[PDB]
Amino acid sequence: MEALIPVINKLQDVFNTVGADIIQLPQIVVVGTQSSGKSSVLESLVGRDLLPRGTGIVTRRPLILQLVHVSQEDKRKTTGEENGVEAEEWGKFLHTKNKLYTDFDEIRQEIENETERISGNNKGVSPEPIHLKIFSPNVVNLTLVDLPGMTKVPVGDQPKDIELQIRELILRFISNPNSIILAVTAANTDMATSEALKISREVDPDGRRTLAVITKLDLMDAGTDAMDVLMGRVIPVKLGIIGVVNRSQLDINNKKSVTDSIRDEYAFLQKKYPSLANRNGTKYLARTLNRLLMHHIRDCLPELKTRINVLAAQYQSLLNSYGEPVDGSGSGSGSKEAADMLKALQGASQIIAEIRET
Numbered sequence: 371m372e373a374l375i376p377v378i379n380k381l382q383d384v385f386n387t388v389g390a391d392i393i394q395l396p397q398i399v400v401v402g403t404q405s406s407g408k409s410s411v412l413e414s415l416v417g418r419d420l421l422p423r424g425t426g427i428v429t430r431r432p433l434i435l436q437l438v439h440v441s442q443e444d445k446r447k448t449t450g451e452e453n454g455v456e457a458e459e460w461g462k463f464l465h466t467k468n469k470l471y472t473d474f475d476e477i478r479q480e481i482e483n484e485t486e487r488i489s490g491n492n493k494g495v496s497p498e499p500i501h502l503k504i505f506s507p508n509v510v511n512l513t514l515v516d517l518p519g520m521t522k523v524p525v526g527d528q529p530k531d532i533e534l535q536i537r538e539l540i541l542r543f544i545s546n547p548n549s550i551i552l553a554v555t556a557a558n559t560d561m562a563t564s565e566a567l568k569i570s571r572e573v574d575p576d577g578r579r580t581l582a583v584i585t586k587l588d589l590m591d592a593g594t595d596a597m598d599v600l601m602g603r604v605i606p607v608k609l610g611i612i613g614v615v616n617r618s619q620l621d622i623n624n625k626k627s628v629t630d631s632i633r634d635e636y637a638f639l640q641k642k643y644p645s646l647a648n649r650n651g652t653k654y655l656a657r658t659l660n661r662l663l664m665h666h667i668r669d670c671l672p673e674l675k676t677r678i679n680v681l682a683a684q685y686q687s688l689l690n691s692y693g694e695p696v697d698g699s700g701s702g703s704g705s706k707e708a709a710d711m712l713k714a715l716q717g718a719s720q721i722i723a724e725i726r727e728t
């Protein structure tokens with residue numbers, strides 16, 4: 371049985387600049403607020419810090435993070451750099467094509483380099499995602515669509531008008547019927563007022579497409595345990611409630627080893643939540659997210675295939691409604707879209723046809 375995650379990864383790449391929304395791809399979309407710790411969740415899954423830091427404003431455009439598992443024997447000759455020590459982990463950006471990044475600091479820098487631009491349109495937020503593959507023996511096969519974080523207070527309770535278009539961007543992504551919403555919220559807050567959960571209920575009223583991740587369990591007030599948060603007595607969400615403890619900024623600056631932060635999280639869970647510890651934590655989260663995505667993709671695969679074909683026939687017949695002038699150039703901008711879309715759909719069906727196992 372062919373692994374389906376790599377297939378959807380390639381489809382994501384195929385529909386990058388051309389418009390992937392109408393495809394309604396099966397994917398996990400990460401919704402979090404400011405100070406929720408969703409960037410840390412991603413880094414917990416990667417096993418490295420790689421996301422741009424901080425201080426402040428930052429991270430406007432979506433990031434499609436594609437974690438690809440490799441064998442520990444599968445390594446890369448690094449850079450040029452006058453060395454040749456074989457590298458165990460590397461990264462690739464779709465914008466830079468086949469270039470290899472063996473230094474995660476150059477990975478973090480390229481993200482900064484691909485973000486924060488004006489981008490030559492008049493906005494503060496761009497809908498165009500960054501595509502980053504991470505090859506590592508320390509990661510599970512998993513892809514996440516990281517969206518720009520919201521303010522932790524309602525949009526009207528803060529002075530920036532731009533927050534609206536941030537909400538629009540998130541809504542645009544999570545309105546995808548085949549998207550799974552990963553809602554990130556800190557245990558440190560009134561969790562039934564999370565902006566992440568609230569905006570998720572706007573497209574998923576009952577939370578049947580939503581999985582809640584509870585971060586910052588180590589930061590709660592004296593003599594609270596969110597056992598209720600562990601229960602999902604309180605949060606109306608169906609795909610699960612998973613509590614984690616990521617590394618703090620203190621830990622990163624101190625260069626806390628990830629092997630040490632992992633067992634520290636585990637030990638914290640064992641102590642504070644003994645009857646629940648086995649269904650919480652970073653490692654657990656990585657495993658159920660992997661299984662969830664695999665099961666979700668195979669569920670959506672048959673409809674995805676026909677939709678690509680249905681879309682193809684529509685765009686082609688639409689090209690015969692536009693349909694001119696037969697000129698080599700200056701044909702149309704709308705005609706150019708449909709042709710570019712048809713080309714991408716062609717690549718999509720090709721990728722899908724290249725699956726075979728029963």
Ligand SMILES: Nc1nc2c(ncn2[C@@H]2O[C@H](COP(=O)(O)OP(=O)(O)NP(=O)(O)O)[C@@H](O)[C@H]2O)c(=O)[nH]1
Nearest residue numbers: 404405406407408409410519585586615616618619
């Ligand atoms: N103690 C502790 N600190 C955490 C945890 N998760 C995140 N943090 C810290 O609290 C902050 C959370 O923000 P971050 O992780 O960047 O995610 P974010 O809020 O989506 N991103 P940002 O606010 O930077 O735009 C970070 O400075 C991080 O170090 C956690 O589980 N425990």
